[PDB]
Amino acid sequence: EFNILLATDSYKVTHYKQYPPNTSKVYSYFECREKVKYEETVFYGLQYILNKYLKGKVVTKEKIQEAKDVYKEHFQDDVFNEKGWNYILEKYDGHLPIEIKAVPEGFVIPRGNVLFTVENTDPECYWLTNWIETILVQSWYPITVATNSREQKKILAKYLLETSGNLDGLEYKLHDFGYRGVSSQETAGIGASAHLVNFKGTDTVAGLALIKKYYGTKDPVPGYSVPAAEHSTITAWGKDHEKDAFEHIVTQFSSVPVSVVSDSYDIYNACEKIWGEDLRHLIVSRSTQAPLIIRPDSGNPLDTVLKVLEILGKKFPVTENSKGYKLLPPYLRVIQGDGVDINTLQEIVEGMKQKMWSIENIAFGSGGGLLQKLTRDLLNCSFKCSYVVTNGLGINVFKDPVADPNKRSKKGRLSLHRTPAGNFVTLEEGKGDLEEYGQDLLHTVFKNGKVTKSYSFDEIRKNAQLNIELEAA
Amino acid sequence: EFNILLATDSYKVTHYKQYPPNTSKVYSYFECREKKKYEETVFYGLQYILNKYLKGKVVTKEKIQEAKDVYKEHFQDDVFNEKGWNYILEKYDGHLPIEIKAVPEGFVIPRGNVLFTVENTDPECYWLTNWIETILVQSWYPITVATNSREQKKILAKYLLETSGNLDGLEYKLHDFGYRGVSSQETAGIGASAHLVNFKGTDTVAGLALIKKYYGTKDPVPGYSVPAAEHSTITAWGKDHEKDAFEHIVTQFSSVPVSVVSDSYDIYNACEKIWGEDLRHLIVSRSTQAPLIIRPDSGNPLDTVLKVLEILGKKFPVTENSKGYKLLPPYLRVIQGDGVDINTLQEIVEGMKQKMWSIENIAFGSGGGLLQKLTRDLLNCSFKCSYVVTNGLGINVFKDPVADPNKRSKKGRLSLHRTPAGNFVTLEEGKGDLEEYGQDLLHTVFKNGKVTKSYSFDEIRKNAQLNIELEA
Numbered sequence: 024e025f026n027i028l029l030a031t032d033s034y035k036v037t038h039y040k041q042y043p044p045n046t047s048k049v050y051s052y053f054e055c056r057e058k059v060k061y062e063e064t065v066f067y068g069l070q071y072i073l074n075k076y077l078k079g080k081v082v083t084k085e086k087i088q089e090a091k092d093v094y095k096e097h098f099q100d101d102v103f104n105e106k107g108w109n110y111i112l113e114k115y116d117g118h119l120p121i122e123i124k125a126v127p128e129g130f131v132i133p134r135g136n137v138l139f140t141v142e143n144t145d146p147e148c149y150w151l152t153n154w155i156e157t158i159l160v161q162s163w164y165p166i167t168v169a170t171n172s173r174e175q176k177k178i179l180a181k182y183l184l185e186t187s188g189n190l191d192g193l194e195y196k197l198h199d200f201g202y203r204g205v206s207s208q209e210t211a212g213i214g215a216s217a218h219l220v221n222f223k224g225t226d227t228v229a230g231l232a233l234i235k236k237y238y239g240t241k242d243p244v245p246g247y248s249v250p251a252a253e254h255s256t257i258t259a260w261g262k263d264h265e266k267d268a269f270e271h272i273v274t275q276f277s278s279v280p281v282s283v284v285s286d287s288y289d290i291y292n293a294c295e296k297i298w299g300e301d302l303r304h305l306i307v308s309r310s311t312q313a314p315l316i317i318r319p320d321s322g323n324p325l326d327t328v329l330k331v332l333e334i335l336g337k338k339f340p341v342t343e344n345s346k347g348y349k350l351l352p353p354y355l356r357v358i359q360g361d362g363v364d365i366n367t368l369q370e371i372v373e374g375m376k377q378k379m380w381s382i383e384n385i386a387f388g389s390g391g392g393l394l395q396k397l398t399r400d401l402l403n404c405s406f407k408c409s410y411v412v413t414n415g416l417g418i419n420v421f422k423d424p425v426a427d428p429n430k431r432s433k434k435g436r437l438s439l440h441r442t443p444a445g446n447f448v449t450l451e452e453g454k455g456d457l458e459e460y461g462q463d464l465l466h467t468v469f470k471n472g473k474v475t476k477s478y479s480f481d482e483i484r485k486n487a488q489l490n491i492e493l494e495a496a
Numbered sequence: 497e498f499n500i501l502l503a504t505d506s507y508k509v510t511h512y513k514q515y516p517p518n519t520s521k522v523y524s525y526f527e528c529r530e531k532k533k534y535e536e537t538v539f540y541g542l543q544y545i546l547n548k549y550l551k552g553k554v555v556t557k558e559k560i561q562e563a564k565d566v567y568k569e570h571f572q573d574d575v576f577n578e579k580g581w582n583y584i585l586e587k588y589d590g591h592l593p594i595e596i597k598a599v600p601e602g603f604v605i606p607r608g609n610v611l612f613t614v615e616n617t618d619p620e621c622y623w624l625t626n627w628i629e630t631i632l633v634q635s636w637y638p639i640t641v642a643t644n645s646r647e648q649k650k651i652l653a654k655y656l657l658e659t660s661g662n663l664d665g666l667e668y669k670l671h672d673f674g675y676r677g678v679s680s681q682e683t684a685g686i687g688a689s690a691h692l693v694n695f696k697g698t699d700t701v702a703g704l705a706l707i708k709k710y711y712g713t714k715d716p717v718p719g720y721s722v723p724a725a726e727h728s729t730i731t732a733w734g735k736d737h738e739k740d741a742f743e744h745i746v747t748q749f750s751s752v753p754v755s756v757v758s759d760s761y762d763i764y765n766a767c768e769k770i771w772g773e774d775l776r777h778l779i780v781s782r783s784t785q786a787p788l789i790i791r792p793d794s795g796n797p798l799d800t801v802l803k804v805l806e807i808l809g810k811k812f813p814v815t816e817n818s819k820g821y822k823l824l825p826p827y828l829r830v831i832q833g834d835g836v837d838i839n840t841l842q843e844i845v846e847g848m849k850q851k852m853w854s855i856e857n858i859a860f861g862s863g864g865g866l867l868q869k870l871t872r873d874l875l876n877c878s879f880k881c882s883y884v885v886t887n888g889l890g891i892n893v894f895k896d897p898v899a900d901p902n903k904r905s906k907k908g909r910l911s912l913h914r915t916p917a918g919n920f921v922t923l924e925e926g927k928g929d930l931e932e933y934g935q936d937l938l939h940t941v942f943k944n945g946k947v948t949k950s951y952s953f954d955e956i957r958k959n960a961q962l963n964i965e966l967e968a
């Protein structure tokens with residue numbers, strides 16, 4: 024079972040002895056520190072953490088003894104604060120005397136603003152604020168996934184709108200393929216859930232259950248998929264029977280959408296001779312609601328897509344849409360599910376545009392690019408102390424490294440407000456109390472072991488919408 | 497609870513309908529595919545997955561119904577294979593009719609070799625082999641962490657030996673700082689455990705319980721740490737009182753090693769004036785078993801390390817070792833715990849050598865670089881079907897994309913052998929049965945819901961040792 028006493032960086036076990044004597048308050052905040060890309064971030068994921076790890080009775084006698092025994096060997100010494108944790112158990116029935124204020128999940132906030140704050144509600148538990156820094160900082164991941172996913176939606180929206188004149192099917196244009204390419208099962212659920220803030224297509228099943236448990240949707244599920252082959256279901260038929268494989272598969276799924284990887288041996292042959300000639304009759308007979316979706320999976324992502332499109336364009340009846348862009352017949356589509364990240368996604372859609380192909384024709388699948396190739400330094404997600412009370416006196420604290428002004432932290436009690444022009448501003452040094460910027464936009468989401476405010480997955484999605492989607496009014 | 501029926505890529509739910517009819521076996525393998533540097537990989541992590549996710553009764557009535565309900569909505573259709581899963585429940589009491597063979601954990605294997613294979617043991621469960629591809633492929637992570645950590649140990653070993661003449665304290669030269677920088681709690685435990693295959697220093701506590709539960713060590717714990725400050729424990733004293741913070745901290749931990757971040761306001765002032773003059777008397781009196789370990793945390797990693805060393809070298813008595821490199825007094829050391837990955841680690845030690853500073857002086861902490869900034873395509877960890885039996889006839893199968901020969905897969909039944917020169921070779925097309933190449937190095941680790949062979953963390957560490965360590 025999880026033990027919050029064992030869920031922090033080792034050195035933090037020793038920090039209680041390091042604060043100035045008579046410290047009664049430690050106050051800390053989390054921001055996506057400012058540095059041309061990623062100017063605004065989607066705040067998402069804290070609610071998961073609060074519910075799974077921080078709420079209720081997270082301290083027991085058994086957990087204290089367990090931590091005590093581990094740390095004695097781990098430090099080769101008795102530095103573990105047994106007394107502090109026993110106080111929490113006895114005084115608060117194992118509930119954390121902590122208050123956390125945060126912006127609503129789904130909110131899109133410019134870099135450099137306070138996103139959440141943490142402070143102890145009991146003087147005895149001054150040391151507790153930064154004990155849970157490590158676990159709270161992991162919110163960087165759902166935040167970064169949601170933001171990076173949304174940034175890709177922006178690109179897709181722009182090119183779909185330009186090449187087709189609408190945003191139909193936008194929420195199915197970037198599909199989650201990252202299940203095998205992430206570092207764990209838990210990461211898979213968290214990351215997939217973060218992607219679903221922006222899209223509805225996912226193969227990472229783990230995301231569904233997490234959303235249902237911690238967030239909730241009106242609909243039965245937040246994400247969807249359709250049948251598709253893998254290399255094993257093609258190659259198993261033997262190299263000489265790839266056509267037999269294709270025919271069986273499209274026949275088994277004749278009335279629903281089906282995607283078929285076509286690069287096991289020769290993508291260009293499979294498109295031109297097998298799909299385009301041998302099995303063409305089984306494709307042109309398919310309903311608009313059940314297209315064949317051809318998936319290339321190798322080579323240069325842009326070059327392969329362009330060639331595949333030129334091939335299908337010569338074997339199938341291509342139309343020209345109202346914007347002048349070429350469109351495959353509605354029973355035929357393409358998905359590129361290899362080598363896709365935010366950079367290559369941009370290169371492909373731009374390349375398609377230059378060759379007069381509508382983005383209607385294509386969908387994208389992304390795995391490691393979507394869920395694994397992200398770090399905490401992408402958005403500079405950072406947790407710092409800004410305010411302490413020692414000897415009854417409030418002190419505004421901060422770091423300001425001489426060789427890196429970018430690592431400067433904010434001072435004093437923080438608050439988030441609207442500016443007269445409708446933008447966000449973070450106020451420091453308790454200045455929010457002056458009431459010149461209206462009310463603090465942060466909400467208390469956690470206090471004394473209880474989750475005091477939460478958001479449905481439907482509300483989060485609403486909060487995270489694009490302006491171009493909002494401009495459908 | 498965890499549901500194996502819900503722990504696969506969505507489209508795999510539909511694969512049981514796509515295999516050739518009359519298919520009784522699907523046989524797949526895992527490799528770190530060679531690319532036209534990481535020429536060898538540490539195999540570690542499978543045993544965790546086997547025990548946590550695959551063993552025992554992993555199928556129940558409720559789990560089948562739950563998946564049926566989820567997939568009906570997820571697909572807007574009834575594609576879920578309720579029959580197949582029910583068969584496993586009734587015939588084998590929810591145990592997976594699967595056999596997995598694997599190279600022993602800790603083993604260091606060149607790229608392009610089979611590391612494990614998976615196959616079904618019951619004809620009806622042909623579809624099951626690749627159902628569990630997704631969960632098994634995630635072993636790429638501890639493999640890649642263990643491998644990348646080991647390569648960094650090679651670099652540290654090389655420079656430590658060259659500048660000091662020995663490898664003393666090597667296993668404490670790269671400390672795990674990655675807990676806050678990883679994507680989740682589970683990843684934290686997995687990654688920290690992989691790093692501990694090569695080193696003994698970690699602040700990612702989660703790794704310790706994972707090792708104890710799934711692997712085991714003779715010693716109480718596999719990893720260690722010492723007291724250290726963070727920015728909050730310094731800054732809380734107020735800007736004008738950094739010295740008070742430093743003094744109080746080194747005094748609290750006078751008898752044990754202590755590390756103190758010194759760049760809150762001005763790293764160069766702190767070393768030359770505060771540590772180097774104001775509090776110098778509290779440093780020079782410390783035991784060799786309890787040094788102060790100064791930590792910079794900003795600026796160019798190499799440039800700051802060099803300047804700090806240059807500062808400390810002129811405020812403290814520096815000796816010159818037998819190899820000619822400069823050495824701080826035993827009560828004073830440095831740890832660089834910011835901006836460290838395998839690339840910058842190389843640049844830092846090389847830079848130190850240029851300036852005649854021994855690697856004895858320095859330790860490294862690595863966080864995101866150690867545990868997060870890694871991907872599956874670093875080693876090209878891949879899982880492919882190589883052999884099936886249809887109509888009673890086994891056929892060798894494989895992919896070979898025209899535009900990327902690097903993605904070509906291996907054919908037929910595989911085995912791993914020692915070459916006459918003592919290296920490694922993977923035999924394809926069942927050629928291992930000819931027995932010209934000694935015994936298959938893969939062992940059955942999993943069969944029919946049971947873990948059949950396990951390894952202690954001690955064995956794994958022994959297996960993954962450096963050659964240069966074996967040379968001593």
Ligand SMILES: O=C(NCc1ccc(S(=O)(=O)c2cc(F)cc(F)c2)cc1)c1ccc2n(cc[n+]2[C@@H]2O[C@H](COP(=O)(O)O)[C@@H](O)[C@H]2O)c1
Binds near residue numbers: 226250390506
């Ligand atoms: O097809 C796959 N799923 C089914 C599927 C079919 C079509 C669409 S659609 O056209 O969006 C669409 C959606 C819709 F809701 C409704 C619709 F009508 C259509 C969505 C989904 C499928 C395919 C492949 C796949 N995978 C999961 C991992 N993989 C491979 O594994 C590797 C992982 O990637 P990385 O190496 O980068 O980490 C990579 O090679 C990658 O190809 C899944």
Ligand SMILES: O=C(NCc1ccc(S(=O)(=O)c2cc(F)cc(F)c2)cc1)c1ccc2n(cc[n+]2[C@@H]2O[C@H](COP(=O)(O)O)[C@@H](O)[C@H]2O)c1
Binds near residue numbers: 677697721
């Ligand atoms: O000191 C820290 N721990 C205690 C400690 C003290 C000394 C040594 S030693 O000299 O190896 C040594 C070892 C030994 F076994 C025995 C000995 F005698 C000596 C090891 C360990 C410490 C410090 C910092 C720290 N952290 C955990 C995250 N962090 C920060 O958080 C951030 C995470 O990094 P990324 O952004 O790259 O992801 C980064 O700013 C990073 O500095 C931990």
